[model samples]
Target: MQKIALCITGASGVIYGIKLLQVLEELDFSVDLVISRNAKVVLKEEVLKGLKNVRIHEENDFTSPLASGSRLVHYRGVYVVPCSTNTLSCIANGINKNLIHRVGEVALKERVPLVLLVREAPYNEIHLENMLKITRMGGVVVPASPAFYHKPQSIDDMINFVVGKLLDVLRIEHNL
Candidate 1:
């Protein structure tokens, strides 16, 4: 696909994925979106709106470009927004059952950026180890922590802080 690949996991911070999609809708880059198996409920709850220029894919669809790593176009990068610890572990341990795991593996092997916006609180030792592994493998671990220094009056500002950082990871400039 010619668009950026994104995986929306079943983490509590589904808003991060929503905000990123909102921003991507208008950017030069299009989106190849894969929603995790358990992410539908969160979508119904946190993000009820539809977006433009987004190619939504199924998690288990192995025929997709993101799943096959047979890119017709070089993406800016792949993002696992609000990455679930379960999927993170799968990615770290190389246990890829679905498209999320496969796309992450593809990105790592292709020497492209694989940014994981991990959204967990009170991390355990295993979580830290996986984060380290991802970093060592040239992937990034972006936390869901929002900064108040931006003087955010609305929830969108808080989202922009983290989303802006994600955009930076892809080398896409924005004024968020």
Candidate 2:
């Protein structure tokens, strides 16, 4: 079975994470998901419930298979959809405060595809620097800036555009 490690941070675009989860579930991928502590609050505020079927791990669960590169070898990619700047900084600086960062660390060290969907507005110098640092270390920093080229008809369409881009990064075929 194909696998992917997906982390959803506290970023505002929780919908992006939800949308990606929905699509991945549709594609029948074995998804290993880690939702940051802060994201729980966002999920509540967004009036959303965590999806079923995916393997969900706690933020501080260090015993997860995702914590080590050797154990995470078969994953197609490591993604931090709606990755917050705080999470991005941690991953960039090698600070593993939780499973999300640890998984990201493993991805970088193992040379696996790591995609960070940074959902921040008005990037600062520090954020840019962190992004550059991650990029230099073989991480793909995809900002949550959605494009209008798809001629979106509804809000879901707009969200699908960004989700499709993530699939593109993973080189997964999809008709989004």
Candidate 3:
């Protein structure tokens, strides 16, 4: 079985993370989830419905086995969904101060697929540069830019488009 790590950062699109979690669970994919401290605050503001039944971890839970590459064989991919500019900078620069960054660092070093669903608007030079760095290191930067080609009619439709794209990056099949 392939395991995956999902990290939710303090970005504007908390719904992306929540929807991703729901999708992953529906797919019966085992996930290790990390929610950033700032993400908790944003969740309250953005997520009208609460996230439930997730194996949640804090940002500083380095004690979690996934913090080390040796213990990361259980997972094949890492996703920082709704990645914030601040979280992107930390992961790009190899700053493993927290479990989110540390697990991503281990994924990079261990050759596990690291996918970032960045949600920043009006991106600047620094953001582009950081994204380049992560790409150079074999990490994927997937922005939460939804496509209208699917003719989405509802908010759920738009959300599924972005989540579907993320699943595409992970090479997973879904009915979205």
Candidate 4:
């Protein structure tokens, strides 16, 4: 099974993460997940779910295999869906305050595909700068913006387009 690491932070579009997880599950991917504390709060308000067969790691569980680069080599890709600006800033600045941050950093260092679906609008100077830095560090910065050319019919379609792009980054074939 393809292995992946997914982090769902406290970004406004929590559904993005949920969608990606569902798609990955459907693909028979072995998922390692890290849900931030604030993301749990977001989940309470979001009203959706799945990910029954995935392995979850705690934020401060530094001992988790994901915390080290040696273990990251097995993961084909790393994703941060609904990556909040807060989480983006932390990962950009090399702040491994939690498992999510550490995994991103490790992925970068290990040359693994790291995609961050940054979920904020009205980008300020700092956001742009951080995105640029992450880009330079070999991470894919996917702004939570959906394409209009595909003529999405519903909110779910838009979300699928975004998640489809994430899969595209890893060159995974999908029908989104």
Candidate 5:
């Protein structure tokens, strides 16, 4: 079984994580999920109504095996959907204060694929510099800038388009 870790941070685009989980579940991928405290707030505010099937790991659950690379090796990759600027900085600067940061650090150190769906807009130099640092350290910084080529009609459609691209980075095939 291929395992994938889906992390939702306190980013603005909570819908991206929700849609990614929905689609990944439909595709029958085994997902190990972690949601930050702030991410739960965003979930309640934006994605509560949409998420019905995804399992969420609590912020305090360090006992979850994925917290370390020794345990996380079973998983193929980790995806931080709707990654916040703050979270991005944390990962870039090697701050593993929480489970999300710990898991991301483990992924990077293990040489496992770590896909970050960066959602900041009008990024300043610091954001770009941090992204570059993370990229240099073997992280894939995928900004959540969906394309108009898909001709999405609804908000969900646009969100799915970005999620589809994320799945691609995970090397999972999906219908866009």
Candidate 6:
């Protein structure tokens, strides 16, 4: 696989996105990160240790390579870790509000794998429909809910479980 397009949205499970990036880092996968405005604050608060040294893109920057479909060919897949409900709807409806949104659309139109880590709970009919729509379009929706079956010892362990599942979605080999 080539570079992966990783997006972090304004959601509660920002740790999941960070952990996913960490694991991708472990595999030495070239990643292009596009972080939303709210995600920056969440990253600052949730990740005291700091983040991976990947190429970061501004959310509203239309000049970003992520905004173009041709440039996205370098990526084998796109993972919207911690995809917010609003962003979910935007992508489902083909709404391009930012670089993250644009790249998601490009991923869909280009038929590349899209793995979404939807973080919200209490899914209503709309959330389900959006998820189903994305799924039917060949996108993978991964809920941020971590599994307890792995017997997590710390918060990091639980986060690893979630990230491991996403890695599974991308078919990336991991030893989580």
Q: For each candidate, what TM-score against the reference?
A: 0.92, 0.94, 0.93, 0.94, 0.91, 0.92
Give the per-residue lDDT digits (tens) of candidate 3, residues 107-153. Answer: 88898899999888798999999999999999999988889998989
* lDDT tens readout by residue for model 5, 90-119: 888888778888888888889889999998
Global lDDT for candidate 3?
Answer: 0.86
lDDT of each: 0.85, 0.89, 0.86, 0.88, 0.83, 0.87
Q: Between 3 and 4, whose TM-score is larger?
A: 4
What's the lDDT of the predicted structure labeled candidate 6?
0.87
- Per-residue lDDT tens digits of candidate 2, residues 1-176? 59988899998998899889888888888899898878878977873545555888989999998998887878999989889988999999999888999999999999989999988779899999999999999889888888889788898898999999999998898989
Model 3 spans with C-alpha error above 4 angstroms: 47-54
Per-candidate clashes come to 0, 0, 0, 0, 0, 0
User: lDDT, candidate 6, residue 67?
Assistant: 80
Q: Which stretches of candidate 6 lie above 4 Å from their native place?
A: 45-53
Residue 65, model 5: lDDT of: 81
Q: Which has the better lDDT: candidate 2, or candidate 6? A: 2
Score candidate 1 by lDDT. Answer: 0.85
For lDDT, candidate 1 versus 2, the one ahead is 2
Candidate with better lDDT, 1 vs 3: 3
Looking at model 3, residue 20 earns an lDDT score of 91
